[PDB]
Amino acid sequence: KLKLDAYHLLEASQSETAAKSALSDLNWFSDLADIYSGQQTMAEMDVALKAQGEQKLSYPIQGKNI
């Protein structure tokens, strides 16, 4: 096992298409993107629950408010 690890590192050094890291196939960038977008949206729509209390409004209307 030790010899094979040495040989793998050596042949990776000798080859040009060698991986820039020994951290095999990464497949957890999608989940990161999804949770990032999810937290962003959840904040964006936990804002406008607070920023739209909207007690009442005052619209100027011809004939009545003027």
Next chain:
Amino acid sequence: GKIHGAVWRMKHLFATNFKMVGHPRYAYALPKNPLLQ
């Protein structure tokens, strides 16, 4: 004596290579490198 000479050369030419974990004719049976892609 022939066998002695053969092993005496095998030592010097195989034991410090880092490239010969076994014989090259049987490298198909080895596991695959995770770093190559």
